[PDB]
């Protein structure tokens, strides 16, 4: 399509890259100040709360005023947030920057989604939601990698990258973006429940493990963010490529729910092995293989959501994004709390939550059979 769609997709890719940027460089940031894991999780958690809280208000402002102005205002706010986060000294000025970045993201995303809905044809809507989910997942995976790439030269420079990219996106959006009783009962509240719970548990577990891995490596291996980000993004690309290339064979002999139940089973058994893992290469390999399952769960979940929606793919995308943010905020606070209380309590929570997802899928299958 036209470059106006490329710019709109970039406006979200960069936002989710900024979402994922903090995790790799976080240990040094809150260890040179000497802060307990609670605040380490609370940073990303507050970002997610800001995003979710401003999402409906951001959409309302986009509707009542205009999509272009809201989009450029949000890009400006995100750029300011990323420039300010690197010039921070204490916890409060960093949490404030994360909150501002979250509100910018949550008031940009509805505007971009509305613009894409208004520019795209009526038939390329499910496909456009597919690209939306793909770009969001790619940003989630790729954020920490860009963080750890030049987290080496200095510990303020990745946020310089984020701010510069935000300014660039704002200047492309300024010159390219131009302006042109049965409402709630359609959802039965009994068909989307299973995919909603499944995407919630997926996002919760993934965010919790992403938060916990850096803390575990910092407190046990005493290593730099470089290969932490390298391992996280390597697991991400491995899982994404594996699924995107072998889904033809996956769909041949497996169903959807069976796939995303055996995924949790594989993840939980590998995490149990991770409990036994205490060596450098051992923990590296076990984290690499753990991330694969969490990364490959998501495509099946969004495919299930698309199949269930059928014609309401906008509703499916909105629900998926909202519950992804729900998981991404519920996770980090509890992960930091358990890491404060015990170094393997987050792992025990993760395996228990994976088993909860397993039994949820099992009861859904039983209900379908009945």
């Amino acid at each position: 399509m036209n470059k106006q769609i490329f710019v709109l997709y970039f406006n979200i890719f960069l936002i989710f890259l900024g979402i994922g940027l903090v995790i790799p460089v976080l240990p040094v940031y809150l260890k040179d100040l000497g802060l307990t894991g609670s605040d380490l999780g609370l940073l990303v958690a507050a970002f997610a709360l800001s995003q979710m809280i401003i999402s409906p208000f951001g959409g309302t402002l986009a509707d009542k005023l205009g999509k272009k102005l809201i989009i450029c205002i949000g890009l400006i706010l995100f750029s300011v947030s990323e420039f300010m986060f690197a010039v921070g000294h204490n916890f409060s000025v960093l949490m404030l920057s994360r909150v501002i970045g979250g509100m910018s993201a949550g008031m940009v995303m509805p505007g971009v989604t509305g613009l894409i809905a208004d520019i795209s044809p009526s038939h390329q809507k499910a496909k456009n939601f597919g690209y939306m989910s793909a770009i969001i997942n790619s940003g989630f995976i790729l954020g920490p990698g860009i963080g750890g790439f030049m987290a080496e030269v200095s510990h303020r420079m990745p946020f310089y990258f984020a701010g510069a990219l935000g300014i660039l996106a704002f200047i492309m959006s300024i010159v390219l973006i131009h302006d042109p009783p049965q409402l709630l009962t359609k959802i039965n509240w009994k068909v989307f429940i299973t995919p909603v719970i499944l995407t919630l548990v997926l996002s919760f577990g993934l965010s919790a493990f992403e938060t916990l891995y850096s803390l575990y490596t910092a407190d046990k291996v005493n290593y730099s963010p470089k290969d932490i980000s390298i391992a996280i993004t390597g697991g991400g690309i491995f899982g994404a490529l594996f699924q995107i290339y072998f889904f033809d064979k996956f769909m041949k002999y497996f169903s959807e729910l069976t796939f995303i139940a055996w995924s949790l089973l594989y993840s939980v058994v590998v995490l149990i092995l991770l409990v036994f893992a205490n060596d450098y290469w051992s923990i590296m390999l076990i984290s690499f293989v753990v991330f694969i399952g969490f990364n490959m769960i998501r495509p099946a979940i969004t495919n299930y959501f698309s199949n269930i929606a059928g014609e309401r793919q906008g509703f499916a995308g909105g629900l998926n994004s909202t519950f992804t943010s729900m998981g991404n905020f519920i996770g980090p606070l509890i992960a930091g709390a358990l890491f404060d209380v015990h170094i393997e309590a987050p792992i025990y929570m993760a395996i228990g939550v994976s088993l909860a997802g397993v039994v949820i899928v099992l009861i859904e299958k039983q209900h379908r059979a009945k």
Partner: antibody
Framework: EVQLVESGGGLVQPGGSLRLSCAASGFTFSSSSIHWVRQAPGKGLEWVASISSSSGSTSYADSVKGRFTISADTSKNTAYLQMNSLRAEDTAVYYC???????????????????????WGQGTLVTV | IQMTQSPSSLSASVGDRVTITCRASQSVSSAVAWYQQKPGKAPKLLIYSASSLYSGVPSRFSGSRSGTDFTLTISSLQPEDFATYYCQQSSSSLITFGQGTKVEI
């Protein structure tokens, strides 16, 4: 207020061509889609074509797939229907209506505007 | 997606209850609309959803859905209602009208 005016029609030689146009006024052309329906004498209506100005997506009925071309220029707020082949079944009174397509933001998701043919202009007549 | 509208003709007096059914084979979405047309004029919008009511339309008109059958109900009739009422569904880019219910008062 809002009104739609159409031009063209009249005696047409079989297999000939005619440019049927709809003039728009009173509404936002780029936030709406102009559709064309057909009314045979003493028969029922049937949708013929549709063009969305906000996205450039055009739709044609199965009986008319690949024989009538529709277009709309935003500069003068006009809607064009190009006829390339006419016949006995094509004689009718052709109407021009406006289909409102603008996303409205319910919280957490955008919903399309309900489908409706709100404003209809007094259609012209095409014979033979 | 063809839709059958039953019946074709429906004579009626004033102040009665008249119902018209237009059945859609693939009915999963409530994208149904109804139009009133007078002889020698253009059709005007009557209903634009399953059970909605456009502004400037008398309140006596109503719509409903049951699985696949779409019902238009005129609870009270007046001489003005002498007209032909058509059904339309636009679930996709393709639009297909009904056959027509020419009521004779």
């Amino acid at each position: 207020e809002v009104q739609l005016v159409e031009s063209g029609g009249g005696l047409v030689q079989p297999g000939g061509s005619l440019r049927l146009s709809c003039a728009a006024s009173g509404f936002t052309f780029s936030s709406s889609s102009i559709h064309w329906v057909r009314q045979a004498p003493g028969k029922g209506l049937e949708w013929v074509a549709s063009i969305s100005s906000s996205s450039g997506s055009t739709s044609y009925a199965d009986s008319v797939k690949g024989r009538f071309t529709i277009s709309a220029d935003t500069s003068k707020n006009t809607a064009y229907l190009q006829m390339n082949s006419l016949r006995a079944e094509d004689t009718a009174v052709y109407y021009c209506a406006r289909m409102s397509v603008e996303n409205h933001w319910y919280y957490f998701y955008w919903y399309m505007s309900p489908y409706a043919m709100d404003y209809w202009g007094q259609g012209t007549l095409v014979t033979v | 997606i063809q839709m059958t509208q039953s019946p074709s003709s429906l004579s009626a007096s004033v102040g009665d209850r008249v119902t018209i059914t237009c059945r859609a084979s693939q009915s999963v979405s409530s994208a149904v609309a109804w139009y009133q047309q007078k002889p020698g004029k253009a059709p005007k919008l009557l209903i634009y959803s399953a059970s909605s009511l456009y502004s400037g339309v008398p309140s006596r008109f109503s719509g409903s859905r049951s699985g696949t059958d779409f019902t238009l109900t005129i609870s009270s009739l007046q001489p003005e209602d002498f007209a032909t009422y058509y059904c339309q569904q636009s679930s996709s880019s393709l639009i297909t009208f009904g056959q027509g219910t020419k009521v004779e008062i």
